[PDB]
Design a binder for this molecule. Structure first.
Ligand SMILES: OC[C@H]1O[C@@H]2O[C@H]3[C@H](O)[C@@H](O)[C@@H](O[C@H]4[C@H](O)[C@@H](O)[C@@H](O[C@H]5[C@H](O)[C@@H](O)[C@@H](O[C@H]6[C@H](O)[C@@H](O)[C@@H](O[C@H]7[C@H](O)[C@@H](O)[C@@H](O[C@H]1[C@H](O)[C@H]2O)O[C@@H]7CO)O[C@@H]6CO)O[C@@H]5CO)O[C@@H]4CO)O[C@@H]3CO
Ligand SMILES: OC[C@H]1O[C@H](O[C@H]2[C@H](O)[C@@H](O)[C@@H](O[C@H]3[C@H](O)[C@@H](O)[C@@H](O[C@H]4[C@H](O)[C@@H](O)[C@@H](O)O[C@@H]4CO)O[C@@H]3CO)O[C@@H]2CO)[C@H](O)[C@@H](O)[C@@H]1O
Ligand SMILES: OC[C@H]1O[C@H](O[C@H]2[C@H](O)[C@@H](O)[C@@H](O[C@H]3[C@H](O)[C@@H](O)[C@@H](O[C@H]4[C@H](O)[C@@H](O)[C@H](O)O[C@@H]4CO)O[C@@H]3CO)O[C@@H]2CO)[C@H](O)[C@@H](O)[C@@H]1O
Ligand SMILES: [Ca+2]
Ligand SMILES: [Ca+2]
Ligand SMILES: [Ca+2]
Ligand SMILES: [Ca+2]
Ligand SMILES: [Ca+2]
Ligand SMILES: [Ca+2]
Ligand SMILES: [Ca+2]
Ligand code: NA
Length: 585
């Protein structure tokens, strides 16, 4: 049977105006091309002078000159070598070639979560061997990351972990060993050596991209030795009993370089394993107490739990964070499990690190709290104005959307919309905990994921994060790149909600800067599935201006009137239910 195997470009693709040919590849060798046309869908003219050439089962069409921003359809009719006839078409959109000129100091900020759980495991290792050396790979990709829009990269924890070469990096062993010493069975971390890391940092900075460290400060695991520890009488398990606790860390492969501090029982409030009885529980150590946290009794999570009331421990961890910034030249931190750590210490440390250099260091805590008011309360409890947090409250709306949400309520969802708190929000759709193969803590955002990135990426407040697994592994890049273009070049000036959202459609306006030509945008996202195009009368804030949809989904333009209003459009489907309308000039 006759049918199109594939094409270049693929249907729905966005291409350069420098594209010279289109190739269609069919299932049988071709005999005739009876009909063929390349149509500009906006002015409805077929381009004259196009040419073609048959090479067995492929057909190559050329001899045209594409216009930036236009939408095109290539129509065909072919007859194969068995006298089968086939009628079809592909369509596409041509990138803009003169984008708005946004001054450096004002370009939007965007972050890449540069990892996922299963990297270099299973079939991931097979299909993506480049990811066996991530530090090397980032140095390599830095230029194209910069071209994509990214201004920062959050790295996985870069220090040695208890699982050695297999530690995704949360099993924290030695913070001062960035893949440089023979510890835990490897010299390198899972991601590469210290050298490679330093090299990656330079490359990234070379292309104007910031580098954040994923600081895991809550616990330690992988002790060099065990000690006999008496448990406090108000311990929840085995009160007043002697246990054998893995609490001795001397880091022998490192031999005192950078810091000669060593760890024992007196550096921890407790642990979750007793090697006499071989039994888990939650074991508080004699005369220790859990540190002050936002919610009651949330200091213990896993591992030997660090005692941040201990001054010698406080002082080493403050030194390390100054080193990461001023010596190894990182630009900021993600704070892991930030709600299980003495909030007095998080403020003290953030402040000591920040005051230590003139660069304006950047801090985002993982405080996994899904109500906005709880999360506000957390940020008020810590009391450090530099602390931003991931917007788990907003992601809860994206989980709602999996089976249908009330789309109008996006006007008020997340920290990113709490007056007084909007710019402390780091917004995101998934991550290594929310989307993982086995053992995941929640359901991933497996449907309407593009609608969700389109929302965070176009928004005037917060700083959005793209998940590596989404961009490179799940095959969403082509789509994501169009939304990164929107953010890089168009998502500027005031934001405006509109007055006609509903159960199924949310729209939003960026007016553009008033002294930059050609910027601004109108977003429409939808949870509709009816399969049809739908319009909304919106004020764009740009009178008498021609707009087009840079997603390529709608093949019309919209010209605003003397007040700025136009009837902008979206497709009601899971799969294409996002459109970003921007100016043609
Ligand atoms: O297949 C088993 C195991 O394999 C892998 O563990 C590695 C690990 O990655 C290596 O670093 C090394 O471990 C060393 C430590 O570096 C060293 O400090 C010490 O470890 C002690 C721990 O500090 C302490 O927690 C305790 O471990 C208990 C543990 O708390 C219990 O929960 C139970 O372990 C279970 C694991 O939790 C579970 O995930 C799995 O283990 C894997 C692990 O995922 C992987 O990283 O199953 C086990 C239960 O079968 O029991 C243990 C004790 O029985 O005490 C340990 C010392 O006993 O010493 C270890 C070396 O023994 O090597 C391991 C093994 O390959
Ligand atoms: O182009 C089609 C679709 O594009 C987008 O889908 C994306 C998802 O948003 C990504 O998250 C990922 O999907 C993963 C998913 O994350 C992962 O858990 C697993 O899916 C399970 C899922 O957990 C489970 O709840 C159940 O429903 O079955 C699934 C099947 O395994 O694997 C998915 C990958 O297959 O990648 C997809 C595809 O790119 C967009 O969200 C959709 O709107 C669109 O249809
Ligand atoms: O040290 C490295 C590990 O920690 C990191 O991620 C973990 C979180 O920091 C930790 O808080 C915990 O998260 C749980 C929440 O504390 C808990 O509240 C719950 O979330 C609720 C939510 O608050 C509620 O409103 C909602 O409706 O339901 C949720 C759960 O049903 O679950 C959270 C997940 O357990 O554990 C985190 C995940 O491991 C690192 O990023 C992680 O990779 C490391 O292992
Ligand atoms: Ca051309
Ligand atoms: Ca803790
Ligand atoms: Ca304590
Ligand atoms: Ca500073
Ligand atoms: Ca729902
Ligand atoms: Ca709806
Ligand atoms: Ca403007
Ligand atoms: Na503690």
């Amino acid at each position: 049977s006759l049918f199109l195997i594939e094409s270049e470009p693929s249907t729905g693709a966005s291409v350069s105006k420098n594209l010279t040919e289109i190739i269609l590849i069919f299932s049988n060798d071709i005999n005739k091309v009876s009909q063929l046309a390349l149509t500009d869908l906006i002015t409805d003219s077929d381009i004259q002078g196009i040419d073609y050439n048959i090479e067995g089962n492929k057909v190559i069409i050329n001899n045209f000159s594409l216009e930036p921003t236009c939408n095109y359809r290539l129509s065909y009719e072919v007859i194969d070598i068995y006298d089968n006839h086939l009628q079809g078409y592909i369509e596409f959109l041509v990138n803009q070639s003169n984008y708005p000129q946004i001054p450096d100091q004002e370009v939007n900020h965007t972050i890449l979560q540069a990892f996922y759980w299963e990297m270099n495991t299973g079939e991931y290792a097979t299909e993506h061997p480049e990811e066996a050396n991530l530090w090397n790979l980032l140095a390599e990709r830095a230029p194209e990351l910069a071209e994509a829009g990214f201004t920062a990269v959050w790295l996985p924890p870069a220090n040695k972990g208890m699982a050695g070469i297999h530690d995704v990096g949360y099993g924290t062993y030695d913070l001062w060993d960035l893949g440089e010493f023979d510890q835990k069975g490897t010299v390198r971390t899972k991601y590469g050596t210290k050298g490679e890391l330093e090299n990656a940092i330079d490359a990234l900075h070379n292309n104007d991209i910031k580098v954040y460290f994923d600081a895991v400060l809550n616990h330690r695991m992988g002790a060099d030795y065990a000690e006999t520890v008496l448990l406090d009488e108000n311990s929840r398990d085995k009160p007043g009993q002697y246990i054998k606790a893995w609490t001795g860390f001397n880091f022998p492969g490192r031999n005192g370089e950078y810091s000669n501090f060593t760890w024992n029982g007196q550096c921890f409030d407790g642990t979750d394993w007793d090697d006499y009885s071989k039994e888990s529980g939650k074991y508080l150590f004699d005369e220790k107490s859990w540190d002050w946290t936002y919610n009651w009794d949330e200091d213990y999570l896993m591992g030997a739990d660090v005692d941040y009331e201990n001054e010698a421990v406080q002082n080493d961890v403050i030194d390390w964070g100054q080193w990461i910034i001023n010596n190894i030249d990182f630009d900021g931190f993600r704070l892991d499990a930030v709600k299980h750590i003495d909030y007095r210490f998080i403020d003290k440390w953030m402040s000591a690190v920040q005051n230590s250099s003139n660069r304006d260091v950047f801090f985002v805590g993982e405080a996994w709290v899904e109500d906005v008011d709880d999360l506000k309360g957390f940020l008020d409890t810590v009391g450090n104005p530099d602390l931003r947090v991931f917007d788990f409250p907003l992601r809860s709306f994206f989980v709602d959307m999996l089976n249908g949400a009330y789309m109008a309520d996006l006007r008020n969802a997340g920290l990113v919309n709490s007056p007084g708190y909007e710019n402390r929000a780091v917004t995101f759709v998934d991550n290594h905990d929310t989307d993982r193969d086995e053992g995941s803590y929640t359901v991933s955002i497996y449907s309407r994921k593009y609608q969700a990135y389109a929302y965070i990426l176009t928004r005037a407040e917060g700083v959005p994060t793209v998940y590596w697994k989404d961009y490179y592994i799940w095959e969403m890049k082509e789509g994501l790149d169009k939304l990164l273009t929107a953010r890089r070049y168009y998502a500027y000036g005031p934001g405006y909600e509109v007055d006609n959202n509903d159960a199924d459609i949310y729209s939003y306006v960026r007016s553009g800067f008033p002294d930059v030509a050609g910027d601004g945008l109108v977003l429409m996202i939808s949870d509709g599935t009816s399969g049809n195009v739908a319009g909304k009368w919106i004020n764009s804030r740009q009178p008498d201006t021609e707009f087009y949809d840079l997603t390529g989904h709608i093949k019309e333009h919209v010209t605003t009137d003397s007040e700025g209003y136009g009837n902008f459009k979206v497709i009601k489907s899971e799969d294409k239910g996002w459109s970003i309308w921007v100016p043609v000039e």
